[PDB]
Amino acid sequence: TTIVGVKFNNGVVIAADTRSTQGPIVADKNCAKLHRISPKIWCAGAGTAADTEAVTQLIGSNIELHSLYTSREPRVVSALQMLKQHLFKYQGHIGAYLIVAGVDPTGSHLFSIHAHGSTDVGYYLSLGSGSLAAMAVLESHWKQDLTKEEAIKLASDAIQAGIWNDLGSGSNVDVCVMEIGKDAEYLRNYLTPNVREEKQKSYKFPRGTTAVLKESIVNICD
Amino acid sequence: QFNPYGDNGGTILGIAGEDFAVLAGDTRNITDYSINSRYEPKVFDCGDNIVMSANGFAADGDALVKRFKNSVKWYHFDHNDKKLSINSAARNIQHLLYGKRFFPYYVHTIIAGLDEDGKGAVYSFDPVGSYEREQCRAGGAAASLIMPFLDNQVNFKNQYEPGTNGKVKKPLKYLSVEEVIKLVRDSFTSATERHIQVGDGLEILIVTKDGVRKEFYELKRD
Amino acid sequence: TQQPIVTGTSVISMKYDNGVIIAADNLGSYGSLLRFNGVERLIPVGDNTVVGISGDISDMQHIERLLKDLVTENAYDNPLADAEEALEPSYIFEYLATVMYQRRSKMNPLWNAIIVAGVQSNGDQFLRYVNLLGVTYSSPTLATGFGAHMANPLLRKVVDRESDIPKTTVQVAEEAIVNAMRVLYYRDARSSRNFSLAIIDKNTGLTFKKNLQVENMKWDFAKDIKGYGTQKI
Amino acid sequence: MDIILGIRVQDSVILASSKAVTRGISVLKDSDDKTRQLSPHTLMSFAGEAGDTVQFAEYIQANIQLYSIREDYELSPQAVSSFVRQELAKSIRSRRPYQVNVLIGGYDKKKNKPELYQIDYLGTKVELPYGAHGYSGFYTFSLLDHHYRPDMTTEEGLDLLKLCVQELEKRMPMDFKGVIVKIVDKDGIRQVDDFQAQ
Amino acid sequence: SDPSSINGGIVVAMTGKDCVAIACDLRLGSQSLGVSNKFEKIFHYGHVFLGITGLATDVTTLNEMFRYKTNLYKLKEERAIEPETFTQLVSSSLYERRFGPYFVGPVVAGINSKSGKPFIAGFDLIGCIDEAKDFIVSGTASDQLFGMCESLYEPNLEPEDLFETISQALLNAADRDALSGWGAVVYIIKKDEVVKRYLKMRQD
Amino acid sequence: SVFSPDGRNFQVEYAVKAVENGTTSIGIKCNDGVVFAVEKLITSKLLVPQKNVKIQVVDRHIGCVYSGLIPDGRHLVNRGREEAASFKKLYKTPIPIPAFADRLGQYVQAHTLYNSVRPFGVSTIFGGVDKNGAHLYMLEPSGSYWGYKGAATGKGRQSAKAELEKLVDHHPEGLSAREAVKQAAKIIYLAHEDNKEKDFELEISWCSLSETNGLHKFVKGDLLQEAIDFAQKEIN
Amino acid sequence: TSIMAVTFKDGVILGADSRTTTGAYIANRVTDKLTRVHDKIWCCRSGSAADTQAIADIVQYHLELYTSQYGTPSTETAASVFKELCYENKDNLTAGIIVAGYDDKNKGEVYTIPLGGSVHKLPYAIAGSGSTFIYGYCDKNFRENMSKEETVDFIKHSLSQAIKWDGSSGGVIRMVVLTAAGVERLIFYPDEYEQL
Amino acid sequence: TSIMAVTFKDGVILGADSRTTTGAYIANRVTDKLTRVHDKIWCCRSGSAADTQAIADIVQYHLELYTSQYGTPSTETAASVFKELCYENKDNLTAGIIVAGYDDKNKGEVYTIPLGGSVHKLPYAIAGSGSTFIYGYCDKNFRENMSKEETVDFIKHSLSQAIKWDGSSGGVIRMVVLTAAGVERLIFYPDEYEQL
Amino acid sequence: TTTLAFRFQGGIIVAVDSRATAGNWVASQTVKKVIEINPFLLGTMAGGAADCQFWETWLGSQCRLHELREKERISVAAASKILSNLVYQYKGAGLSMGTMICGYTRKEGPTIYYVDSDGTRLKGDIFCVGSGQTFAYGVLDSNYKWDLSVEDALYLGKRSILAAAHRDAYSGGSVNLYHVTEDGWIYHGNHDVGELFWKVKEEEGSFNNVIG
Ligand SMILES: Cc1ccc(CNC(=O)[C@H](CCc2ccccc2)NC(=O)[C@H](Cc2nc(C(C)(C)C)no2)NC(=O)c2cc(C)on2)cc1
Ligand SMILES: [Mg+2]
Ligand SMILES: [Mg+2]
C-alpha cells in the first residue's frame, strides 16, 4: 500500500494505489483504498484492512449524526479527534493507519493517524509499505503554494514511485481532490498504467471435459 | 517482576507437657544475609490462654496473628464471652489459612495451650490450613535440625531398654517443665551453632491453668 | 506489578537516651543518572514524628499526600487535636504498615522502604521499619538499602542492645549518624554529599536540619596509588 | 486415548466403547460404561479429558430428559445432535472449554432410519455410516472402508465390530480392556453384555 | 493446529455472462485423517449463496447464524436479502467478533434479482470485503486456486462454459493440496434456474 | 420534586421553618478574615461545659456553623470535607471559598430535585481566607447562597441581623478580627433575647490572616473571656 | 527528542526540536512538540506520542473546566493534573512531560514529570533522549534571572548540541515565550544553529 | 567510568575518574585508570576490568618486544596492537580503550578503540558511561593547540561534569601529561573540582 | 501416601498410611488420613494435606445438613457426588486430591467411590490411591478373594499398606484399619510400621530382601 496526501493553496488531495495483498499473494487487483468519512472529508488507510475500514465507517456514522444534531458541516478536526480517541482506547490493537484529509468551513486540513492514537499535521504525508518510495518523491518535488494541477501530478507521481518500487503496492492510482470552493471530486482509476497483456492462448475447455457424478436442479422459492 | 514473598528466618518450637505447654522462638529477624532485628518477638499471647507463632514470611505471619486475635475478640462478642478452646482455635486457624489457598500465607504456624481436660496441647499448621495435634513440633529455618532431636528426646524414638536386646522400647513418659525448658534451650543453642538465620535471643512462653508466663535467654549474636 | 523509576537511597536512624535521630540524603536517582539534587525524603508529621522514605519517589510523594491529609482528618471534630488526641508515631506507622501490606496483597506495591522515627507522648522512643512487602521490624538502629549493610554495623557499635540506649547522648548519636553518612557517600554509588537530618527529643521536640554536608573526607592517600598491579609510575 | 466406535447398519446403530479407566501408571477400572442414555431411542458415547467427560454427558442427559417430560415427546436424533453440537460450540470459546468428543447413535421413529453422529469438542458435527474418536479411528476407518456394506443386518454389524476390536487389540499400544457394545434400533437400546470372551 | 488448517477445504466463485458459479470440495479432515466425504461448504439463503472454508465448527455456526438473520430479515423487509446487502451483513457480523474471530474465509455468490447483474465477494476472518468481480478464492489451497483462476478465467463466459472453467480450476488446485479434495460440488447460477453438479475426482 | 402552583417548592419551605426553629448562629466578615459564633442552649446542668462543639472545620482554612437539625448540618460538613479533599488531590492548592460554596450549593440543591429525598433542614454559615481575601457565605435549604458582610440564621436571626446592619453602616472602613470576636459575643447575647427560657453557652471561632495565619482556630481561654466580659458589659 | 524549559527574569521559555522517528526512519521532520494546555501554560512532550497527546488533551479539558468554574489555574495546578494522570496510570504510560507556565503572582515556573509520575519544580529542566548529551553543558551555562535574548541563546545552543549527537533529535528549533507581554513563537533553522 | 585524552600544543593529556563499581557498590574509590604501555604511550580503559587489564598486559608485552628489536614504537603502532586484540576477539571482550601518546616526529596523538574493535584517530576523545553527559560541553569547549594549563582546565571541568551526573564515575581526577619534557602525573581532589 | 479400600463377602476394608511430606522432608508420621463422616460413612485422603482435610471436613458438614433436611442418612453415591461436584467447580485452579468415599446404606449395600480433583468419580470394588498405590495393588490384587474371612481381609489390607510403606519413600508411619458392615464402621486400631514390619517378617517369613 502507498497512500499520500498533498495540500495545495486552495485545498487538499489524497491518492492511493489499488493493490491489496494476502501475504505475498495479490487478492484484489483493483480495490478502493480511498474511503469517505463525510462528503468532503476523505480517508486513506493501511495496516489491517478490516480495521481501517470499520474505524472509517464507525466515525463516518457518528460524524453524520453529529452533523445533523449541530446543523453544521462536519469538521476534519472532529474526525481526527474521534478517530484518535477510539484508536487510543484500544491501545494499538486496531491496526489502523490513516491519512485523513478534507475541507470544511474553516479551510483545508491534512493529518495522519497512527494505530496507537497519535496524530500529526503536515503539508504532505505518506503511509504504507510504499511510504518511503513516495516520501522520496515528495521531498524532491513539493513546494509551497502548489496549484491544483501540480498537486495532483505530485500526488500521482508519489503513488507511482510506490507502485513500481514497492512490492506491496501496484496496479492503478485513485485520486480524490478536495477544494475549498466546490464538491470533493473522486477520480477512481485516475491512472491505469498496469493493463494485463493479451494472453497467448484461450483456455476455454471443450464442453464435456469435466466428469460429473450426478446432477440436480436446486430450489430457491417456497 | 514483583515478588510478593520474602523470608525472614527464625525458628519456633512447641512442646506439650501433662498440664502445661511451651511455645518458644528466637528473637532474630533477617533478610538474605542482613539482620533486621536481634529482638523482634514472634510468639504472642492471644487471650483465652492461647499462645501463637506464625513463622516464615513475617508480613504474612503478622497479618495472620492479627486476624486470629480479632477472631478471638469477635468470638467473645458473638458467643457470650465463652472461652475459646484450643481445638476450636485450631479449626478457626485452618479456615483463616484456607481462605488464602490461592495466595497463601507463607508461614508454618504453631499454637499451644491446654485442652478441655487441662492437658498440654500443641497444634501445627501448614501454610494452607492442614493441621494436627502433636506432642511437640519445630518450625521455621532450623526445624530440620531440631525435629529429629525432639523425636529422640521428647518421644524417645529409636530408644530401647538396655539388655532387652532391642525387643522392648523405652516407655513413653511425660516431661516436667524444668526438663522441657532444658530441652528448648539446648535445641536453640544447637540450632544457633549450625543455622545462620538462628541467633540473638530465645523467648519462651509457658501456658498453665495459672495463665501465661514469659522467660528470655541470650543467644549467640554471630 | 511495576518497577521503580526515580529513586532515593538509604535512610538511617538510631535511638539515644532522650529521642531518635534519622537522616537521608537529598538525591533522586534515575538508574545511574544522578538526576535530581534537591529532594527531601524526611517528612515531619506534627512535631513528634519524622517519616524517612527510600525507594520510588513518585510513591514517596503519594505517601506524603497521605500523611498530610491524615493530619487534616485527625483535626476534624477534634478539640484535643493538638493535645491528648494528637497523632502519635505508633498511629502513623500502623497506618502506613496497613497500606503497604494491602498494596502488596493486591500485587500493586508502593515501591518503598520506610522508617518511622518519633517520641510517644508518654516519652517512649519510637523507631520502626516497614517496606513494599509489608514487613515490619523494630531495633535500636534501623537503616534501608546500603545503609542496612554499612550504616547498621557502625551504629550498632554505639548501641548494641536496649540497655545501651540510656548511655547514649545526642552528641554521640548525631556523631555516629553523621559519620555513617560519610561512609555511605564513600561506597554508595547512588548517594549524594548533601543530606537532611532530624532529631526528635522528648525535651527539645523536633529539630529539623537541612543542607548538611559530608565534611572531613580522606582522599590524600589516593595520589600514591598507581597502576593495578605491576605498574610503578 | 479411550476407544469410541460407532457403526450404522441398515436397521440399527451400534456403539462400542472401551472399558478401561487409566490414571497415570494404573488401570483403575476395567468395566466402565462410557455411555449415557439420552432418551429411549438415543444414546451418546464419550471420550476426552478426565472429569469433563461425565459432567458433560450428564448435563446433556438432564436437558434431554427435561425436554421429553415437558413435551411428552422424544426429540429426534438429528435434533439432539444439534443441541449437543451448539453446546460444544459455545464451550469452545468460554473460559474453560469442555474437552469431550462424542458419538450420538439414535433411531428416528418418524423416519424409521437409524442415525450416527460424530461430534468433537470443537463442535464439529457430521453424519456418517461409521465413526470413531481418537487414535482408534486411524485403524478402523480404512478397515470399515473395505468391509462395510450399507444394507447389513444387526448381526452382520456386530461381526464388523469384532474385526475392529481385534484389529485394535493387535495394533494399539495400550490395553483398553475390551469394549461394551450397545444397539439402538426400533425397540430402543440394549446391551450385548457378553462381547469379551465370546 | 492453526485453526484455518485443522479441517481443510476450498471454495471458489466466478462470474460469467448473466450467471455466477460457486464450487467447493467435500473433504472434512482432522489433520491427516480424512473423516467425512460429504461435508458441503456452500449454503443458500434465498437466491443468495454463501461458501465458507476454515474451521468446520465455525462454518456450521456461521451457516446457522446467517440462516437466522436472513429469516428475520425476510419477515421484516417482506423480500429476500440481496447479494450486496448480504455481503455487508457478513462483513459486519465477522467484525463484531474482532478480538475472538471465527476462523473462516467466506465467499458470496448470487445474482441481483432487480438489476440482474452477477455478484461475488470474499472476506478475511474479521470481515474485510474482497470485491473482485472476476473470481474469489478461499481455503487451504488458495495459492493454487489463485493460479488456476488467473490462468483459466476469461470474462463473459456462458453458463455451460463457466461450468468447465470453474470445475477445472477447483479440481487441479485440489490435487496439489493435501487437505483438500475428496469430492466437489459446483453450483451454476442463473436469474431463473440453479443447477448443482457433483464432480468425479481423485479420491486420494 | 414538587412545585406548588406559585412556583415555590413547598418541601423546601417547610425545611426553612425547621431552621427558623433552631438555635441562633452568626458570621461576621472582617478586613482580613471571618469570625463565627453560635448559641448553645444549656438543656441541663448535666451538659459538660465547652464539650458539645457545634462549630466544625473543613480542610484547615474553612469554618462551618449552622442552625436547624444538627444531624443535617454534620452530613453537609462531611460532604464538604470530601469535596475539599477531592479538590486538593486533583489541583494541589486548597479549595478557594467561592469554589467550596458552589460545591455545597449544588449538593444541597440536588436534594430539592427528587421526590425520594428530603431537603436539608439547616442554614449554614461558613467561610475562611483563601488566596485572594476573606469570604463569608450563608446557604439556605434551597441551595441558595450568597456572599455576606454579615450573616445570621436561627430563632434570633432578626435581632442579630439588625445589629449586623448597624456595624456595617458604622464601620465602612472595615472591622478588625480582634474586634469582630467581641462584637460576635455581643450579638449572640443580644440574639439570646428571643430564646431566653434556657441558659446558654457561647462558642466562637475565627480565621484571620494575621491572627491565625489564615487557618481556622477556636477562640478559647483569655480571648473568650474578654469577649464574654465585653458582651456582659453592654447588657447591664 | 530534545526538550527544555527555562525560567528567566521576565518569565519562562519552552524549547524543542522537530523530529519524530519510528526506528531509524524520520516519520516527521517538522513536528510541533510545544503544546498549549492553557493561555500561558504550555508543556513539552517526550515518550510515546500517543500517550503524551492523549494526556495533554485531557489536561487541556480539565483546565478549561477549571477556568469556567474557578478562574485561571496556577502552573502548579496544571502540573498536578499531569501528575495525577501520569502516576495513576503508570503501568500503561510512557510519558515524560515538562510543564512550564507564566503567572502574574508566581511569574515563570517549570515542573518536570518523568516516567514514574513524580513532580519536580526546577529553575530549568531538560528531557528526551537527546538531553543526556547536554547535562554537563546546561549545568555549566544556566544562571538565574537571565535576559530574554540570553535565554533564547542558552536554549538555542543547548538544543543544537543535543541535535548534533542524538539521532532521534533534529530538524528546526521551536520556542515559546511566556511573559506578561503575551505569547511569542520563535523558530530556528539548521543553517542558523548548526553554525554555533 | 569517565575517561578522556586531549591533544594540545606541546603533547597530549589523559584524564580519568577513580571509581569502580559492582552494581551500586563502590568496589574501589581510588582506582588508577591511566595505564602505561610504554614510556610515552598510555591508555584509558573502560568496559570489563578483567578484559582491559589482560589486553593492556598483552599490548605492553608486544611493545616491549617491539622496542628490543625495532626501537621505539609509534602511538599508531600501539593503537594497532590494541585494535588487533580487540577486533580479533570481539566475541569475548567488552573493552573500550583510548590510546594516547607522544613521540618527537608525530607529536601528540589520540586513538579511540570502541566496542567493535574499530580505530579512530581524533584530536580528543571521551569514553565511559559518564562521557555521555559531556558530549555537548566538550564539543563546545575544545580548541586545537591549547596550552598545558588550558588543557588541564578543560579535562578538569569536563570530568567534573561527568562525575556530577554519572553515578559510576567519581572519586579523584587523575591525569597524565605526555610531552618532550617527559611524563607528569596529576591528581585533583573532590573539594577542588566540585566548586567549579 | 497409600490408601486403599476393598469390598468383600463381609463388607468393606479401608486401610491408610499416616505420613506427610514436603519434598524429601518427612513432615509427620502420625497424620489421620481417614475421616469419619457419620457412623456409616468414611472418606480417605491422598494428595494435598489441606485440600483433603478441608474439603472432606466440609463434606461432613454437607452430609449432616442432608440428614436434617431429608430425615435420612445420605447415600454414598450422593455424598461422593457432593465432593465430586465441588471439586469440579475448582478444576484448573490446582487443587490436588484423590479420595475414596466408603460406606453402607440399606439401598446400596456396601459401596466405594473414588473421587479425584480432575473430577473423576468411579464406583468399584477395589481402589488404591496415592504415590504408593502400585505397591498396594500388587500385594492386594494377588491375594484378593471375594470369600476372605473378616480376619483375613483385615490382614490383607494392613499387609498391603505395609508393602507400600516399605517400598514408597513417601509412605510410612503406621496403618489405620477400618471395617465397614451394615452396623457401620469399626476401627481396627493403629499399627506402627516400626513394630509391624519386624513382627510380620518373622511371622510370615517374607521380606527376604531385607537384611537382619
Ligand atoms: C491430612 C493429610 C495429611 C497428609 C496427606 C499426604 N500429603 C502430603 O503429605 C503432602 C504431599 C505433597 C503434596 C502432594 C500433592 C499436592 C500438594 C502437596 N504434603 C503437604 O501437603 C505438605 C504438608 C506440610 N508442609 C509442611 C511445611 C510447613 C511446608 C514444611 N509441613 O507439612 N504441605 C505442602 O506441600 C504445602 C506447600 C504449600 C505452599 O502449602 N502446603 C494427606 C492428608
Ligand atoms: Mg490421501
Ligand atoms: Mg558521580
Q: Domain with D82 in it: what CATH number? A: 3.60.20.10
- Where in chain H are the domains? 1-196
Q: DSSP label at H39?
A: T
Q: Which helix (H) or strand (E) holds I198?
A: helix I193-204
Centre of ligand 1 to C-alpha C136, Å, is 28
Asked if chain H contacts chain D via 3 or more Cβ pairs within 8 Å, the reply is no
Domain span at residue A213 reads 1-222
Fold of B1-222: Glutamine Phosphoribosylpyrophosphate, subunit 1, domain 1 (3.60.20)
SS3 assignment for chain C: CCCCCEEECCEEEEECCCEEEEEEECCEEECCEEEECCCCCEEECCCCEEEEEEEEHHHHHHHHHHHHHHHHHHHCCCCCCCCCCCCCHHHHHHHHHHHHHHHHHCCCCCCEEEEEEEECCCCCEEEEEEECCCCEEECCEEECCHHHHHHHHHHHCCCCCHHHCCCCCHHHHHHHHHHHHHHHHHHECCCCCEEEEEEEECCCEEEEEEEEECCCCCCHHHHHCCCCCCCCC
With a CB cutoff of 8 Å and minimum separation 6, the contacts of G194 are G160, G164
> In this complex, which chains have at least 3 CB pairs below 8 Å with chain F?
C, G
Q: What is the CA radius of gyration of chain A?
A: 21
Domain with residues G1-196, CATH architecture: 4-Layer Sandwich (3.60)
Distance B125 CA to ligand 1 centre (A): 10
Q: Grid coordinates representing H113?
A: 578503540
Q: Which residues of chain G does A132 touch, with a Cβ-Cβ cutoff of 8 Å? A: 25
Ligand 1, from B53, B110, B130, B144: best to mutate by most atoms within 8 Å of Cβ?
A: B130
Tell me which chain C residues have a C-beta less than 8 angstroms from the C-beta of B39: 139, 161-162
| Cβ of I27 less than 6 Å from ligand 1 | yes
- Yes or no: say if I132 and I15 are a contact pair by the CB < 8 Å rule: no
Whole-Å CA distances, E83 to E44, E58, E110, I172: 11, 21, 6, 75
Residue E104 cell numbers, joined: 473462516
Alpha-carbon dihedral of residues F112, F114, F117, F118, nearest 10 degrees?
30
- In this structure, are strands A96-104 and A41-47 parallel, antiparallel, or unpaired? antiparallel
Residue I61 CA to ligand 1 centre (angstroms): 23
Resolution of the deposited coordinates, in angstroms? 2.7
Written as one letter, the residue type at A176 is C
Architecture of the F1-236 domain? 4-Layer Sandwich (3.60)
Please, which chains are in contact with A (at least 3 CB pairs closer than 8 A)? E, G
Among all chains, which residue has been given the C-alpha cell 549518624?
C177
φ, ψ (nearest 5 deg) of residue B48: 60, 25
Interface of C with F in 62-101 (CB under 8 A): 65, 69, 72, 75-77, 79
User: Measured between CB atoms, which of C188, C219, C228 is closest to H190?
Assistant: C219
Chain-centre distance for alpha carbon B100:
21
Other beta carbons within 10 angstroms of residue B7's beta carbon come to 15
Q: CA dihedral in degrees (B187, B193, B199, B200; nearest 10)? A: 100
Kindly state the cell numbers that stand for H37.
Answer: 604501555
Flag whether H touches F (3+ CB pairs, 8 A cutoff): no
**Dihedral of CA H41/H47/H49/H53: which sign?**
negative
- Sheet of B211-218, strands arranged across: B136-140, B11-16, B21-26, B201-208, B211-218
Helix axis angle for B177-194 and B143-153, nearest 10°, is 150
Q: Which residues of D touch E8 (CB under 8 A)?
A: none
- Work out the minimum CA distance from I134 to partner chain D, whole angstroms: 7
What are the grid coordinates assigned to B162, written together?
538396655
Tell whether ligand 1 has an atom less than 6 A from the beta carbon of residue I170. no
Q: Are H168 and C34 an interchain contact pair (Cβ–Cβ within 8 Å)?
A: no
In angstroms, rounded to a whole number, what is the distance separating the alpha carbons of residues H83 and H118?
A: 7
Q: C33 CA to chain B: closest CA distance, Å?
A: 22
I57 SS3 class? helix
Kind and range of the H or E element at E113?
Answer: none
Element (H, E) at D44: strand D42-48
Q: Give dist(CA E203, CA H109) in Å, integer.
A: 81
How far, in Å, CA of F208 to CA of E176, rounded? 93
- Between the CA of G124 and the centroid of ligand 1 the distance, in Å, is 60
Q: What DSSP designation does I182 have?
A: T
Kindly state if the Cβ of I20 falls inside 6 Å of ligand 1: yes
How many distinct structural domains can be found in chain A? 1
Dist CA F210 CA C187 (whole Å): 50
Q: Name the closest ligand to CA E182.
A: 2
Question: How would DSSP label each residue in D79-106?
Answer: HHHHHHHHHHHHHTTSSS---EEEEEEE
Alpha helix (H) residue ranges in chain F = 10-20, 70-91, 97-110, 157-170, 177-191, 221-233
Q: Return the amino acid letter for D161.
A: L
Between CA C152 and CA B36 the distance in angstroms is 9
Cell of A105: 468551513
Per the CB < 8 Å rule, is B98 touching I54? yes
Looking up cell 499531569 gives G82
Residue type, I146: W
Facing residue for E60 by CB, picked from D125, D127, D128 = D125
Of the candidates A1, A2, A18, A52, the residue annotated as catalytic is: A1
B49 φψ region: left (φ > 0), alpha (ψ -120 to 50), beta (else): left
The Cα–Cα gap between E80 and E71 comes to 9
Residue F136 near residue F29, CB atoms below 8 Å = yes
**C135 CB near a chain F CB, below 8 Å?**
no
Q: Which of D2, D21, D23, D99 to mutate to test the interface with I (most CBs of I within 10 A)?
A: D23
The helix (H) or strand (E) run that includes residue I138 is: helix I133-141
Question: And the C-alpha cell for D127?
Answer: 453424519
- CATH number, domain of E46, equals 3.60.20.10
What are F34's three cell numbers?
471571618
Q: What is the CA(E176)–ligand 2 centre distance, in A?
A: 11
How far apart are the C-alpha atoms of C63 and F170, rounded to whole Å?
A: 51
Of the listed ligands, the closest to the CA of B57 is: 1
CA of I171 to the centre of ligand 1 (A): 13
Of F50, F51, F59, the CB nearest to C72: F59
- Other CB atoms within 10 A of residue B209 CB: 9
Residue D110 belongs to domain spanning: 1-198
Distance CA D70, CA D76 (A): 15
Q: What is the CATH number of the domain that holds A163?
A: 3.60.20.10
d(CA H19, CA H28): 6
Contacts of D96 in chain I (CB under 8 A): 91-92
Task: Say how far residue F96 (Cα) sits from the centre of its chain.
Answer: 17
DSSP string, G79-121: HHHHHHHHHHTGGG--EEEEEEE--TTT-SEEEEE-TT---EE
Of G117, G152, G154, nearest to G139 by C-alpha is G154
Question: By C-alpha distance, which of G158, G114, G169, G136 is closest to G14?
Answer: G158
Which chain I residues touch D55 with a CB distance below 8 Å? 88, 119
Burial of E117 (0-12, 13-18, 19+ CB in 10 A): middle
Report DSSP state, residue F3: B
Q: I164 Cβ partners below 8 Å, 6+ apart?
A: I2, I17, I128, I130, I132, I133, I135, I136, I139, I171
| Residue owning the nearest CA to atom 43 of ligand 1 | I49
Find, in chain B, the residue whose alpha carbon is nearest to that of C110: B2
Per-domain residue ranges for chain F? 1-236
Give the position, in ligand 1's atom list, of the atom nearest the Cα of I21.
Answer: 9
Give SS3 for I47: strand
Has H1 been annotated as catalytic? yes
Contact of chains I and D by CB distance (3 or more pairs under 8 angstroms): yes
For ligand 1, atom 11, name the residue with the nearest CA: I21
Q: CA of G81: how far to CAs of F87, F90, G62, G74, in Å?
A: 11, 6, 8, 11
With CB atoms and an 8 Å threshold, state whether B94 touches I53: yes
Strands B29-31 and B34-37: antiparallel
Report the gap between the CA of F209 and the closest CA in chain G (Å). 18
Counting the structural domains of chain E, the total is: 1
Contacts (Cβ under 8 Å, ≥6 apart) of E42: E11, E22, E23, E24, E49, E50, E51, E185, E187
Amino acid letter at F166? K
DSSP for chain B, written as a single string: ----------EEEEEE-SS-EEEEEE--EEETTEEEES-----EE-STT-EEEEEESHHHHHHHHHHHHHHHHHHHHHTTT----HHHHHHHHHHHHHTTTTS---EEEEEEEE-TTS-EEEEEE-TTS-EEEESEEEEETTHHHHHHHHHHHTS-TT-B-TTSTTSSBPPP-PPPHHHHHHHHHHHHHHHHHH-TT--SEEEEEEEETTEEEEEEEE----
Contact across the interface for I54 and B134, Cβ inside 8 Å: no
> What is the DSSP code string of B112-167?
EEE-TTS-EEEEEE-TTS-EEEESEEEEETTHHHHHHHHHHHTS-TT-B-TTSTTS
Cα separation, B4 vs D47, in Å, equals 41
Residue A167, SS3 per DSSP: coil
CA G189 to chain C, closest CA, distance in angstroms equals 30
A120 contacts on G by Cβ (under 8 Å): 20, 27-28, 31
Sequence letter at residue D41: H
Looking at the DSSP bridge assignments, the partners of residue H28 are H20
Mention every residue, 6+ apart, whose C-beta is less than 8 A from residue B162: none
Angstrom distance (rounded) from CA I203 to CA C110: 67
Which domains does chain I carry? 1-212 (3.60.20.10)
Q: Whose CA is nearest to atom 34 of ligand 1?
A: I22
The answer to the question of whether I49 is labelled as a binding residue is yes
- State the Cα torsion A153-A156-A161-A164 to the nearest 10°: -120
The order of strands in the sheet holding G120-121 is G34-38, G41-47, G95-101, G109-113, G120-121
